[PDB]
Symmetry: D2
Subunit: 295 residues, 4 copies
């Protein structure tokens, strides 16, 4: 037999806000492979996510092939915009969603993980935001652009920089990107193109640095369109899904567990020679040199 075996491994997944995104899909497949799952959930939705899970609202999505339910060892409120408490502005501190929580900056979450688990094996980054995604880049503000980069790109560096010293041998990371990183996709606004370009560039540089510092592998998955929370909010994700079905080598729609399976493989000992890679899991759409009108 050939197993993707993650038994006893501890994965931290940053960016699970419901059962509809890639983060959930990755969690599910890492669990199928035997991993222990810790979750970073964004502060302003932490209460609702954690409550919905306890109230059984996600149970249809928790079914594992062994009959058991997907279970998280711990869920940490987190805002990966902030490395230390000093970084948090008064506007955030006085926000009612934040004021009733504590220990949610990156350095703080990592210290808690260290206290309770000692080490991690797998770091998964499945988070992105721009406050101005609906704006053309020409019309995107400086603060908006830098916010897109801070949340969507630097957040990875912060997570790896802080978790790195407590990663075990054979540890690796996963982040998620989209092809608009280095090809023009009108509609992907608010500096999100730059944030993904940065994320992909950093994947390569970090593969070398983390590789030489800790022996850690660093890979990114470029996914096709999915009607997640983020996806649905853009306003036309359904048009993108349909377009990809007409465009791609294969017509099947994305499912979060497809990206999850690729992530499981990449963080497993079966991928020890794979690092710095951008792996396309988009039914081959990215290889096309023309749109479906000229087929």
């Amino acid at each position: 037999m050939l197993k993707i075996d993650l038994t006893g491994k501890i994965a931290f997944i940053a960016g699970i806000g419901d059962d509809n995104g890639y983060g959930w899909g990755i969690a599910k497949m890492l669990a199928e492979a035997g991993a222990t799952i810790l979750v970073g959930t964004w502060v302003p939705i932490y209460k609702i996510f954690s409550q919905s899970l306890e109230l059984g609202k996600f149970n249809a999505s928790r079914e594992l092939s062994n009959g058991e339910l997907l279970t998280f060892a711990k869920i940490y409120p987190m805002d990966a915009s902030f490395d230390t408490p000093e970084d948090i502005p008064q506007e955030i501190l006085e926000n009612k969603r934040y004021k009733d929580l504590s220990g949610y900056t990156v350095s703080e979450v990592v210290e808690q993980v260290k206290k309770h688990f000692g080490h991690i094996d797998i770091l998964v980054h499945s988070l992105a935001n721009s406050p101005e995604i609906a704006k053309p880049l020409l019309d995107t503000s400086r603060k908006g652009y830098l916010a897109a980069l801070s949340t969507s790109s630097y957040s990875f560096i912060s997570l790896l920089s802080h978790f790195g010293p407590i990663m075990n041998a054979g540890a690796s990371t996963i982040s998620l990107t989209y092809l608009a990183s280095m090809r023009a996709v009108p509609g992907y606004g608010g500096g999100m193109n730059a944030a993904k370009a940065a994320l992909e560039s950093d994947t390569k540089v970090l593969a070398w640095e983390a590789g030489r510092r800790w022996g850690v592998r660093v890979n990114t998955i470029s996914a096709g369109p999915l009607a997640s929370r983020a996806g649905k909010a853009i306003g036309f994700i359904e048009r993108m899904v349909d377009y990809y079905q007409d465009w791609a080598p294969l017509p099947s729609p994305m499912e979060a567990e497809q990206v999850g399976a690729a992530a499981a493989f990449l963080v497993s000992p079966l991928a020890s020679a794979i690092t710095g890679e951008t792996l396309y899991v988009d039914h081959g759409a990215n290889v096309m040199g023309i749109g479906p009108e000229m087929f």
Copy 2:
């Protein structure tokens, strides 16, 4: 549990000549996954390969995790330079090692597979040759350049074209490449650069064509240096292995099974959304923008 399960599937691997190349490594991992293995072996070395196998010469390399030995259901003498018997030059017809054999063109091998097995599930292409690899491309002859393309590139198209109509649902292909395809590597001569460029370009085109025609997936793996038969003949493979260790994000040398494990994943149902991809399994050397002296 998460398994890469190929039990009941038939893989045809074109290009196993001994236990020291990537083809053997791929066979071993597909077998670990449960796949039944058919092999195409170059005519002039078919007798020695088959005989050595039966003598137990490769037994140390044959051991599997379950305690079984790697076994081939059938080994076919084959020369992928030829599609039909009408293609074979008189000199080859008169050659000692060809003249007392028959049915070694691509069409003939596929017809024998179809008769005895009906269908295949996985096609692996692990074969390359240029008669002029030591020569700078500037000094490579038309005959040499086209022979490199014929053997190393077109052979994949012939194998997929002939096998495609008998591939089952969920079928996929793997071929092997090297980064000199689209970056200049002095010493990768005799048109091998062009043969690899063509193979990767063909990978994308065939992913669309085979995807739409048969639902077949088509992927390529770009590997790090290995001291195979072909690798040792170039004359400086050990220096290349050493260079990659100094250069890459991770220092581990290539092992055939690392590419085998990648192949096994790519052909499994876990990778249904992956097609047209070039997957680097080279310890990240390919992502570097400068060599080791400037680190």
Copy 3:
């Protein structure tokens, strides 16, 4: 003033069949810059081209900005499929177009150029053919695929290898490619995708080899769609032209002289630091991540 000054430089342009392709456009712009123009014209259309030129049929297309006419110092019948007369099948020798002519192999043309002009300064490759472009790659024959490679890609190596020894200091080359080389474009069949992938790969390799051997620069231009002879012959070039207008950052249709202007700059002393480059002259269509429908 800043001039692209090719005064006294001798350019050999392989692939001018009439006034409608990129070869002619390149010739006009090199002529504007002051270059002497030598032409290689495909054997089967050599007489036709020469006779049309003599009857004044292209005179409207010959007007240079200085009031003079685009003038060719010599037009050579050529077939770049053949390096030496020994390579020509008797079947070709007996064809009427070839029987009426002589000295059209690559070696023979270069020998005539050396005899009467001594050296050249610029080599332009503006030729391609596949006998099976209407066929899916899956359905393309070995003979067809290799013929595309021989005519469209090896021909460049042959011309550079033969002309290189008689190139003056500061010499450079230009070839023409299309984005289907490394992205999948259904309809670009007959192995043309592989031929352009090979052409682009060889550009990089030859930049290094010819740069080190003769100080020669080697560049390629990836152009937008044009209704040339070859263009029109695909049967749907007009739809490709219209598609590009809806798709690209800029809407203007290709003109042969746009590519010609890029060629003129790249072969001028102003581009001494540019080599191995693939320069897109396609109104930016190649940078798009989706087609028109999702704008």
Copy 4:
């Protein structure tokens, strides 16, 4: 004759602090082509630069081919970190070098140019900085990374956003980048890899956006190493220069005017079909697949 004709065209160059950088080289070549030259100079070094200029310290680097001296029509104090006065932080406002100057935010500078000149034709972005360039990406702070993106990447968007509406027909932009944007170069620290990745991604997106909005073309040049102000502070620029000479297809060192000549071509009417392009002007180093250490 074939002229790169910029007669009467108004060019604004962001990032000239002395005569040793790419900005100066670009100015000189645009001036050779006939352009009027406006310069944006970083506030802290605006006085030293303008005083050095009129003192005649740069007269040796000002000589043009027509026998005239390079002349800046207007030199504007500028800090491209700031879009409007509202953006300026307290420490900067009270700083010795800013506190007496006024109108140095991007919006204010564009307004001055609009009053003075009505419109512009060419925008050159030759600026970059990270306060943490010596630091591994892993050790780079959030403030440092975002500062690198703000100064090196968003600044271009701000300049184009503000300048666009007063750009004439046929207008275009140039920026400068380095290959570390999408390939790992250890030592290009402080988030500069991400800054350049963003710059290049933005080039593609803005080519579409600016192309459709104003008909403006947008291109970037990727240069080899130069001993500039920024280049020398890095601390090993001479080693990089030597490495490139050993590595590249051609051995000549970079000269600022090489990038300048490429820039003049790209902003000229001869390049009307070129947009969104990344043009390498680095003697071909970028196309290499291995380092000099082998060969």
